[PDB]
Ligand binder design. Sequence first.
Ligand SMILES: *[C@@H]1O[C@H](CO)[C@@H](O[C@@H]2O[C@H](CO)[C@@H](O[C@@H]3O[C@H](CO[C@H]4O[C@H](CO[C@H]5O[C@H](CO)[C@@H](O)[C@H](O)[C@@H]5O)[C@@H](O)[C@H](O[C@H]5O[C@H](CO)[C@@H](O)[C@H](O)[C@@H]5O)[C@@H]4O)[C@@H](O)[C@H](O[C@H]4O[C@H](CO)[C@@H](O)[C@H](O)[C@@H]4O[C@H]4O[C@H](CO)[C@@H](O)[C@H](O)[C@@H]4O)[C@@H]3O)[C@H](O)[C@H]2NC(C)=O)[C@H](O)[C@H]1NC(C)=O
Ligand SMILES: *[C@@H]1O[C@H](CO)[C@@H](O[C@@H]2O[C@H](CO)[C@@H](O)[C@H](O)[C@H]2NC(C)=O)[C@H](O)[C@H]1NC(C)=O
Ligand SMILES: *[C@@H]1O[C@H](CO)[C@@H](O)[C@H](O)[C@H]1NC(C)=O
Lengths: 324, 91
Amino acid sequence: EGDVTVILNNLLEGYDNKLRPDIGVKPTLIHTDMYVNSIGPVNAINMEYTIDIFFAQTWYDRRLKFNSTIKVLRLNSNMVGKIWIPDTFFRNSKKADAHWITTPNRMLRIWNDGRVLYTLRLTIDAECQLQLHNFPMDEHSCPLEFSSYGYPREEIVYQWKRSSVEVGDTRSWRLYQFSFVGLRNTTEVVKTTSGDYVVMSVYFDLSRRMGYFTIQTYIPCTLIVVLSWVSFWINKDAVPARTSLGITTVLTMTTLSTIARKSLPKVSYVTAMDLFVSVCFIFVFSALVEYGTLHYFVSMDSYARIFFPTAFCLFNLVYWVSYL
Amino acid sequence: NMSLVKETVDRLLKGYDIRLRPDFGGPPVAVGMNIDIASIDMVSEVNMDYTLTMYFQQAWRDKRLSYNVIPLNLTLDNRVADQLWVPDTYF
Ligand SMILES: *[C@@H]1O[C@H](CO)[C@@H](O[C@@H]2O[C@H](CO)[C@@H](O[C@@H]3O[C@H](CO[C@H]4O[C@H](CO[C@H]5O[C@H](CO)[C@@H](O)[C@H](O)[C@@H]5O)[C@@H](O)[C@H](O[C@H]5O[C@H](CO)[C@@H](O)[C@H](O)[C@@H]5O)[C@@H]4O)[C@@H](O)[C@H](O[C@H]4O[C@H](CO)[C@@H](O)[C@H](O)[C@@H]4O[C@H]4O[C@H](CO)[C@@H](O)[C@H](O)[C@@H]4O)[C@@H]3O)[C@H](O)[C@H]2NC(C)=O)[C@H](O)[C@H]1NC(C)=O
Ligand SMILES: *[C@@H]1O[C@H](CO)[C@@H](O[C@@H]2O[C@H](CO)[C@@H](O)[C@H](O)[C@H]2NC(C)=O)[C@H](O)[C@H]1NC(C)=O
Ligand SMILES: *[C@@H]1O[C@H](CO)[C@@H](O)[C@H](O)[C@H]1NC(C)=O
């Protein structure tokens, strides 16, 4: 007994949690908010990103109305299973789960006018359709779409608060090669087989940082094709030396083509990194066939001694400006 | 109108036998099926499988769950699926 016990036992008598508030009157207006904690790693081979949020929803329920000196009933997650909660699901989430240690991480606060606030902690692997062209210099806008599952537009209308989306410090975020540029929230009505649903989207603008691949595949390949260009300084009578240099350069260019493809997923189109790999491979192959042609002629070295460094130097001005 | 919907739902769920199918001793119930393919994730050759996400949807007729006063379709909560008969569809 007491004050809050009789209030809760009077609210929950004659209550059906199956029926939404104003089931045959008007659509239920739900004000959502969110507070991102740490956007996790953006996985490119599997095409999703991880996000940890404090998803909070607010609506009105006229059955949860009490008149007393108590203004707010601050309750734990035990009262979630007794009242009505909208069936908000994330439309592009591959897998998600709430947190259940040491207690279900849910909050429930009921005001005296019927206003209900319901906050829970979620970890969501949401699908982002990252286009890997331009990679490793890509830029993406990752969405987070949520809507009610069963209730159409005529029954639940979601709405955004002005300062609903709250990000964190943006440094505890495990985004390594990317960097959150900003956020934008939108709302729209989708049409499905069951009916029309209000869909709320949050777009996360992420721009990449290539510092990682520079040491992965760029510098490494550039230094191999620099080692391709020293063959011209070796004398033409040293045939096994220069052909050993040639075969080692081409086999390791194939090896570095294979290794750098392991980071990329199995897509059909070509990327700028693959274009750079192909340009380096045809440069070293041109160097080997130029040395071969010189060997068959003696049985132009200086001519290449300037042309082959310069052709890559004009290429890098072409490649980096056009992709940046 | 909330009290009318309340007493109608309480009338529908009272005496409802979960173990018997619609027309249990009568004719086979016709179950119409709609599928909305959301995504296909991993067409894997090493495990010989594909991962498929879909909005699986079934539709049949239960004559016990019929009401006449209310003229709009009732979208109930998802927790009444443990109280209503559903088909035993598997893959
Ligand atoms: C097919 O079979 C499977 C297996 O039987 C069915 O799945 C099961 O479904 C039931 C019913 O929903 C669940 O029971 C409920 O579980 C939650 C907690 O769920 C968390 O813990 C689960 C247990 O974890 C075990 O395994 C992990 C493995 O790592 C271990 O670490 C743990 O120690 C455990 O050994 C875990 O499985 C859950 O993860 C799964 O589900 C989540 C869903 O969000 C997914 O994301 C995950 O990917 C994964 O699939 C999850 O981590 C309990 O909280 C429930 O108890 C509350 O609710 C009851 C019903 O209302 C109530 O009676 C209880 O008193 C209790 O209520 C309290 O909490 C409520 C919370 O709001 C309050 O409202 C309430 O007032 C009160 O305070 C309940 O026990 C099974 O856990 C789940 N198990 C699995 C393996 O999935 C599946 O449904 C079947 N499918 C079909 C279509 O039939
Ligand atoms: C309840 O849902 C049914 C779904 O079939 C709706 O009935 C259909 O309405 C469309 C649009 O007018 C018609 O073209 C179909 O012929 C109807 N189908 C059937 C089988 O009758 C119905 O309108 C819905 N009711 C409400 C109140 O939304
Ligand atoms: C998104 O948030 C802003 C915050 O000011 C709000 O004005 C807007 O209505 C919300 N959604 C849209 C684009 O309708």
